[PDB]
mmCIF file of N, CA and C in Angstrom:
data_model
loop_
_atom_site.group_PDB
_atom_site.id
_atom_site.type_symbol
_atom_site.label_atom_id
_atom_site.label_comp_id
_atom_site.label_asym_id
_atom_site.label_seq_id
_atom_site.Cartn_x
_atom_site.Cartn_y
_atom_site.Cartn_z
ATOM 1 N N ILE A 1 59.774 86.775 138.636
ATOM 2 C CA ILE A 1 58.901 87.887 138.146
ATOM 3 C C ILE A 1 59.736 89.172 138.073
ATOM 4 N N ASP A 2 59.403 90.146 138.931
ATOM 5 C CA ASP A 2 60.068 91.442 139.074
ATOM 6 C C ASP A 2 61.568 91.403 138.791
ATOM 7 N N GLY A 3 61.972 90.648 137.774
ATOM 8 C CA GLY A 3 63.382 90.545 137.463
ATOM 9 C C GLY A 3 64.182 89.675 138.402
ATOM 10 N N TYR A 4 63.594 89.233 139.511
ATOM 11 C CA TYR A 4 64.256 88.332 140.446
ATOM 12 C C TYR A 4 63.553 86.983 140.443
ATOM 13 N N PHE A 5 64.217 85.986 139.875
ATOM 14 C CA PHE A 5 63.825 84.596 140.029
ATOM 15 C C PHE A 5 64.606 84.041 141.210
ATOM 16 N N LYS A 6 63.900 83.732 142.288
ATOM 17 C CA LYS A 6 64.522 83.355 143.545
ATOM 18 C C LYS A 6 64.339 81.869 143.797
ATOM 19 N N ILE A 7 65.363 81.252 144.371
ATOM 20 C CA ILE A 7 65.377 79.821 144.619
ATOM 21 C C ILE A 7 65.271 79.590 146.119
ATOM 22 N N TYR A 8 64.527 78.557 146.491
ATOM 23 C CA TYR A 8 64.337 78.185 147.880
ATOM 24 C C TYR A 8 64.704 76.716 148.026
ATOM 25 N N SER A 9 65.010 76.289 149.245
ATOM 26 C CA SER A 9 65.473 74.921 149.446
ATOM 27 C C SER A 9 65.112 74.483 150.857
ATOM 28 N N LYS A 10 65.426 73.225 151.152
ATOM 29 C CA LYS A 10 65.177 72.589 152.436
ATOM 30 C C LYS A 10 65.704 71.165 152.339
ATOM 31 N N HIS A 11 65.962 70.568 153.500
ATOM 32 C CA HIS A 11 66.320 69.160 153.581
ATOM 33 C C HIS A 11 65.653 68.570 154.809
ATOM 34 N N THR A 12 64.925 67.474 154.622
ATOM 35 C CA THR A 12 64.145 66.933 155.711
ATOM 36 C C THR A 12 64.238 65.413 155.739
ATOM 37 N N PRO A 13 64.323 64.820 156.930
ATOM 38 C CA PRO A 13 64.152 63.367 157.047
ATOM 39 C C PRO A 13 62.689 62.990 156.877
ATOM 40 N N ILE A 14 62.441 61.863 156.215
ATOM 41 C CA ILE A 14 61.099 61.297 156.129
ATOM 42 C C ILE A 14 61.204 59.780 156.239
ATOM 43 N N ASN A 15 60.439 59.200 157.161
ATOM 44 C CA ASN A 15 60.388 57.755 157.330
ATOM 45 C C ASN A 15 59.261 57.102 156.541
ATOM 46 N N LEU A 16 58.346 57.881 155.974
ATOM 47 C CA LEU A 16 57.221 57.303 155.260
ATOM 48 C C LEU A 16 57.696 56.734 153.927
ATOM 49 N N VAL A 17 56.909 55.799 153.389
ATOM 50 C CA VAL A 17 57.320 55.082 152.185
ATOM 51 C C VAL A 17 57.524 56.050 151.022
ATOM 52 N N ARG A 18 56.524 56.888 150.740
ATOM 53 C CA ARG A 18 56.652 57.844 149.646
ATOM 54 C C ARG A 18 56.225 59.251 150.042
ATOM 55 N N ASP A 19 54.927 59.433 150.258
ATOM 56 C CA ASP A 19 54.316 60.756 150.258
ATOM 57 C C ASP A 19 54.680 61.523 151.527
ATOM 58 N N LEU A 20 54.174 62.750 151.629
ATOM 59 C CA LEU A 20 54.677 63.783 152.517
ATOM 60 C C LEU A 20 54.028 63.709 153.901
ATOM 61 N N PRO A 21 54.735 64.168 154.938
ATOM 62 C CA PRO A 21 54.151 64.186 156.286
ATOM 63 C C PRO A 21 53.313 65.425 156.551
ATOM 64 N N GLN A 22 52.901 65.596 157.806
ATOM 65 C CA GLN A 22 52.094 66.731 158.230
ATOM 66 C C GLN A 22 52.926 67.927 158.672
ATOM 67 N N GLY A 23 54.249 67.809 158.687
ATOM 68 C CA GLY A 23 55.102 68.855 159.207
ATOM 69 C C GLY A 23 55.232 70.038 158.271
ATOM 70 N N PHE A 24 55.644 71.165 158.845
ATOM 71 C CA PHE A 24 55.874 72.394 158.101
ATOM 72 C C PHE A 24 57.318 72.451 157.628
ATOM 73 N N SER A 25 57.506 72.949 156.408
ATOM 74 C CA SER A 25 58.829 73.073 155.811
ATOM 75 C C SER A 25 59.078 74.531 155.455
ATOM 76 N N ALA A 26 60.027 75.156 156.141
ATOM 77 C CA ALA A 26 60.375 76.536 155.838
ATOM 78 C C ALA A 26 61.558 76.578 154.881
ATOM 79 N N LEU A 27 61.431 77.384 153.831
ATOM 80 C CA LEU A 27 62.416 77.433 152.756
ATOM 81 C C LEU A 27 63.026 78.825 152.717
ATOM 82 N N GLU A 28 64.318 78.906 152.935
ATOM 83 C CA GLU A 28 64.943 80.218 152.840
ATOM 84 C C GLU A 28 65.253 80.524 151.384
ATOM 85 N N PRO A 29 65.273 81.791 150.984
ATOM 86 C CA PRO A 29 65.764 82.124 149.644
ATOM 87 C C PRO A 29 67.257 81.846 149.549
ATOM 88 N N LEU A 30 67.649 81.125 148.505
ATOM 89 C CA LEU A 30 69.066 80.856 148.302
ATOM 90 C C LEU A 30 69.757 82.066 147.692
ATOM 91 N N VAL A 31 69.439 82.370 146.438
ATOM 92 C CA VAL A 31 69.976 83.521 145.743
ATOM 93 C C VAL A 31 68.827 84.250 145.053
ATOM 94 N N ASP A 32 68.865 85.578 145.121
ATOM 95 C CA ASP A 32 67.906 86.408 144.412
ATOM 96 C C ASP A 32 68.570 86.937 143.150
ATOM 97 N N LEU A 33 68.258 86.345 141.994
ATOM 98 C CA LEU A 33 69.065 86.696 140.793
ATOM 99 C C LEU A 33 68.357 87.566 139.765
ATOM 100 N N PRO A 34 69.088 88.466 139.072
ATOM 101 C CA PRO A 34 68.511 89.245 137.981
ATOM 102 C C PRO A 34 68.323 88.267 136.820
ATOM 103 N N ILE A 35 67.074 87.919 136.533
ATOM 104 C CA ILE A 35 66.792 86.918 135.468
ATOM 105 C C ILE A 35 66.139 87.663 134.308
ATOM 106 N N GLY A 36 65.061 88.400 134.595
ATOM 107 C CA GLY A 36 64.348 89.198 133.578
ATOM 108 C C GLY A 36 63.539 88.357 132.602
ATOM 109 N N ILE A 37 64.206 87.507 131.815
ATOM 110 C CA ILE A 37 63.513 86.674 130.784
ATOM 111 C C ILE A 37 62.537 85.700 131.455
ATOM 112 N N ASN A 38 61.311 85.619 130.923
ATOM 113 C CA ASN A 38 60.256 84.701 131.433
ATOM 114 C C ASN A 38 60.460 83.305 130.832
ATOM 115 N N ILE A 39 59.895 82.271 131.465
ATOM 116 C CA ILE A 39 60.018 80.877 130.941
ATOM 117 C C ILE A 39 58.612 80.345 130.636
ATOM 118 N N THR A 40 58.359 79.956 129.382
ATOM 119 C CA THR A 40 57.026 79.429 128.975
ATOM 120 C C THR A 40 56.732 78.099 129.686
ATOM 121 N N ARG A 41 57.731 77.211 129.764
ATOM 122 C CA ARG A 41 57.581 75.870 130.392
ATOM 123 C C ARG A 41 58.956 75.372 130.850
ATOM 124 N N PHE A 42 59.034 74.109 131.282
ATOM 125 C CA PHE A 42 60.294 73.536 131.743
ATOM 126 C C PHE A 42 60.203 72.015 131.734
ATOM 127 N N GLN A 43 61.299 71.385 132.143
ATOM 128 C CA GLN A 43 61.413 69.960 132.422
ATOM 129 C C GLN A 43 62.616 69.795 133.345
ATOM 130 N N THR A 44 62.672 68.682 134.069
ATOM 131 C CA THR A 44 63.767 68.427 134.997
ATOM 132 C C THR A 44 64.958 67.860 134.228
ATOM 133 N N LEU A 45 66.033 67.573 134.958
ATOM 134 C CA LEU A 45 67.229 66.968 134.392
ATOM 135 C C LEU A 45 67.554 65.684 135.135
ATOM 136 N N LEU A 46 68.422 64.884 134.522
ATOM 137 C CA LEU A 46 68.668 63.532 134.989
ATOM 138 C C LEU A 46 70.154 63.230 134.929
ATOM 139 N N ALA A 47 70.553 62.214 135.684
ATOM 140 C CA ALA A 47 71.912 61.691 135.644
ATOM 141 C C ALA A 47 71.832 60.186 135.430
ATOM 142 N N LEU A 48 72.309 59.727 134.278
ATOM 143 C CA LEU A 48 72.282 58.315 133.916
ATOM 144 C C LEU A 48 73.706 57.925 133.553
ATOM 145 N N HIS A 49 73.931 56.653 133.249
ATOM 146 C CA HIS A 49 75.279 56.191 132.966
ATOM 147 C C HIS A 49 75.283 55.074 131.934
ATOM 148 N N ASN B 1 72.018 111.703 160.714
ATOM 149 C CA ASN B 1 70.990 111.716 159.686
ATOM 150 C C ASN B 1 71.520 110.876 158.532
ATOM 151 N N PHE B 2 71.060 109.642 158.419
ATOM 152 C CA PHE B 2 71.783 108.658 157.634
ATOM 153 C C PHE B 2 71.094 108.365 156.311
ATOM 154 N N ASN B 3 71.909 108.044 155.313
ATOM 155 C CA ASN B 3 71.441 107.479 154.055
ATOM 156 C C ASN B 3 72.237 106.213 153.773
ATOM 157 N N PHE B 4 71.547 105.082 153.680
ATOM 158 C CA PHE B 4 72.165 103.804 153.355
ATOM 159 C C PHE B 4 71.600 103.306 152.035
ATOM 160 N N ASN B 5 72.440 103.282 151.001
ATOM 161 C CA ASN B 5 72.070 102.747 149.695
ATOM 162 C C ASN B 5 70.723 103.296 149.242
ATOM 163 N N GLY B 6 70.562 104.607 149.370
ATOM 164 C CA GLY B 6 69.316 105.262 149.054
ATOM 165 C C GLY B 6 68.294 105.279 150.165
ATOM 166 N N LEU B 7 68.419 104.411 151.163
ATOM 167 C CA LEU B 7 67.538 104.470 152.322
ATOM 168 C C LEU B 7 67.950 105.634 153.204
ATOM 169 N N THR B 8 67.030 106.555 153.452
ATOM 170 C CA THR B 8 67.308 107.699 154.302
ATOM 171 C C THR B 8 66.569 107.561 155.621
ATOM 172 N N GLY B 9 67.174 108.097 156.664
ATOM 173 C CA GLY B 9 66.556 108.088 157.969
ATOM 174 C C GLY B 9 67.468 108.787 158.943
ATOM 175 N N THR B 10 66.890 109.159 160.079
ATOM 176 C CA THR B 10 67.622 109.851 161.128
ATOM 177 C C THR B 10 67.417 109.107 162.433
ATOM 178 N N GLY B 11 68.500 108.597 162.997
ATOM 179 C CA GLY B 11 68.379 107.834 164.216
ATOM 180 C C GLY B 11 69.715 107.665 164.887
ATOM 181 N N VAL B 12 69.732 106.803 165.892
ATOM 182 C CA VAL B 12 70.944 106.475 166.624
ATOM 183 C C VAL B 12 71.414 105.114 166.143
ATOM 184 N N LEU B 13 72.483 105.105 165.365
ATOM 185 C CA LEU B 13 72.992 103.867 164.799
ATOM 186 C C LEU B 13 73.868 103.176 165.830
ATOM 187 N N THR B 14 73.562 101.920 166.128
ATOM 188 C CA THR B 14 74.287 101.171 167.139
ATOM 189 C C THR B 14 74.661 99.816 166.569
ATOM 190 N N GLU B 15 75.544 99.118 167.269
ATOM 191 C CA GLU B 15 75.733 97.709 166.974
ATOM 192 C C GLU B 15 74.505 96.931 167.425
ATOM 193 N N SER B 16 74.261 95.796 166.781
ATOM 194 C CA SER B 16 73.072 95.024 167.085
ATOM 195 C C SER B 16 73.335 93.551 166.824
ATOM 196 N N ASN B 17 72.681 92.706 167.610
ATOM 197 C CA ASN B 17 72.891 91.273 167.526
ATOM 198 C C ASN B 17 71.910 90.564 166.610
ATOM 199 N N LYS B 18 70.857 91.238 166.152
ATOM 200 C CA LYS B 18 69.900 90.584 165.272
ATOM 201 C C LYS B 18 70.572 90.213 163.957
ATOM 202 N N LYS B 19 70.247 89.031 163.447
ATOM 203 C CA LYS B 19 71.009 88.403 162.381
ATOM 204 C C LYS B 19 70.155 88.280 161.125
ATOM 205 N N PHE B 20 70.555 88.974 160.062
ATOM 206 C CA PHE B 20 69.812 88.932 158.814
ATOM 207 C C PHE B 20 70.005 87.618 158.079
ATOM 208 N N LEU B 21 69.117 87.379 157.141
ATOM 209 C CA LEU B 21 69.437 86.494 156.044
ATOM 210 C C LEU B 21 70.282 87.248 155.026
ATOM 211 N N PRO B 22 71.191 86.552 154.355
ATOM 212 C CA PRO B 22 72.183 87.242 153.511
ATOM 213 C C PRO B 22 71.616 88.157 152.439
ATOM 214 N N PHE B 23 70.583 87.727 151.724
ATOM 215 C CA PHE B 23 70.073 88.520 150.609
ATOM 216 C C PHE B 23 69.319 89.755 151.069
ATOM 217 N N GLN B 24 68.913 89.794 152.330
ATOM 218 C CA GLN B 24 68.026 90.817 152.855
ATOM 219 C C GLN B 24 68.689 92.183 152.872
ATOM 220 N N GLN B 25 67.854 93.211 153.014
ATOM 221 C CA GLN B 25 68.341 94.582 153.121
ATOM 222 C C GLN B 25 67.905 95.217 154.435
ATOM 223 N N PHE B 26 66.639 95.585 154.578
ATOM 224 C CA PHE B 26 66.154 96.278 155.761
ATOM 225 C C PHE B 26 65.599 95.287 156.763
ATOM 226 N N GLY B 27 65.986 95.431 158.015
ATOM 227 C CA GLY B 27 65.145 94.949 159.079
ATOM 228 C C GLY B 27 63.973 95.890 159.283
ATOM 229 N N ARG B 28 62.897 95.376 159.861
ATOM 230 C CA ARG B 28 61.755 96.223 160.167
ATOM 231 C C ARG B 28 61.137 95.774 161.475
ATOM 232 N N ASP B 29 59.976 96.346 161.758
ATOM 233 C CA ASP B 29 59.325 96.230 163.043
ATOM 234 C C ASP B 29 57.833 96.080 162.788
ATOM 235 N N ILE B 30 57.064 95.945 163.870
ATOM 236 C CA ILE B 30 55.627 95.732 163.751
ATOM 237 C C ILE B 30 54.964 96.883 163.011
ATOM 238 N N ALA B 31 55.512 98.084 163.132
ATOM 239 C CA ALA B 31 54.934 99.264 162.512
ATOM 240 C C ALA B 31 55.385 99.465 161.072
ATOM 241 N N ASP B 32 56.172 98.534 160.528
ATOM 242 C CA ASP B 32 56.753 98.624 159.190
ATOM 243 C C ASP B 32 57.859 99.676 159.163
ATOM 244 N N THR B 33 57.974 100.448 160.242
ATOM 245 C CA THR B 33 59.048 101.417 160.376
ATOM 246 C C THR B 33 60.403 100.730 160.310
ATOM 247 N N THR B 34 61.361 101.407 159.683
ATOM 248 C CA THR B 34 62.716 100.881 159.564
ATOM 249 C C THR B 34 63.271 100.673 160.967
ATOM 250 N N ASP B 35 63.866 99.507 161.204
ATOM 251 C CA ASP B 35 64.430 99.213 162.515
ATOM 252 C C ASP B 35 65.919 98.919 162.425
ATOM 253 N N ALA B 36 66.280 97.815 161.785
ATOM 254 C CA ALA B 36 67.674 97.435 161.644
ATOM 255 C C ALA B 36 68.077 97.566 160.186
ATOM 256 N N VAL B 37 69.354 97.869 159.969
ATOM 257 C CA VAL B 37 69.907 97.977 158.625
ATOM 258 C C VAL B 37 71.237 97.248 158.572
ATOM 259 N N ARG B 38 71.712 97.035 157.356
ATOM 260 C CA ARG B 38 72.967 96.346 157.116
ATOM 261 C C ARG B 38 73.911 97.285 156.397
ATOM 262 N N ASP B 39 75.063 97.524 156.988
ATOM 263 C CA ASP B 39 76.016 98.442 156.396
ATOM 264 C C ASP B 39 76.559 97.825 155.121
ATOM 265 N N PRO B 40 76.334 98.434 153.961
ATOM 266 C CA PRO B 40 76.793 97.793 152.723
ATOM 267 C C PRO B 40 78.300 97.625 152.607
ATOM 268 N N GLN B 41 79.101 98.652 152.904
ATOM 269 C CA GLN B 41 80.535 98.553 152.629
ATOM 270 C C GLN B 41 81.195 97.469 153.466
ATOM 271 N N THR B 42 80.734 97.276 154.691
ATOM 272 C CA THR B 42 81.073 96.090 155.461
ATOM 273 C C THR B 42 79.812 95.612 156.146
ATOM 274 N N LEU B 43 79.452 94.359 155.906
ATOM 275 C CA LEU B 43 78.143 93.912 156.326
ATOM 276 C C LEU B 43 78.110 93.853 157.840
ATOM 277 N N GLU B 44 77.229 94.640 158.429
ATOM 278 C CA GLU B 44 77.041 94.614 159.863
ATOM 279 C C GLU B 44 75.635 95.100 160.120
ATOM 280 N N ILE B 45 75.061 94.649 161.220
ATOM 281 C CA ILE B 45 73.650 94.864 161.484
ATOM 282 C C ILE B 45 73.536 96.020 162.463
ATOM 283 N N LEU B 46 73.057 97.147 161.975
ATOM 284 C CA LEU B 46 72.934 98.344 162.783
ATOM 285 C C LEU B 46 71.486 98.511 163.205
ATOM 286 N N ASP B 47 71.265 98.770 164.489
ATOM 287 C CA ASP B 47 69.942 99.182 164.921
ATOM 288 C C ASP B 47 69.661 100.613 164.484
ATOM 289 N N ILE B 48 68.449 101.054 164.779
ATOM 290 C CA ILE B 48 68.044 102.441 164.685
ATOM 291 C C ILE B 48 67.229 102.733 165.942
ATOM 292 N N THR B 49 66.928 104.014 166.206
ATOM 293 C CA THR B 49 66.194 104.402 167.447
ATOM 294 C C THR B 49 65.691 105.849 167.309
#
């Protein structure tokens, strides 16, 4: 928004088959960057071979 | 009577052990009053009083 698009992250062990546990996940800001331009939509990226 | 990167205040600047997150600027306190600051020219965590 305010010109700063900020990224957050975390890494957690999970023993469950798929879905999420009851624990809390705290995410620190990685980098606070001057972005300015808004994004209408998105999609993820992939690595294939 | 200090000015840090446009932040003005008058206090006793000391060394301090409280540890910022890197992107952060001001430490604060329960009263929202400025408490700890980070010296821009060399990053160090200064108290106030």
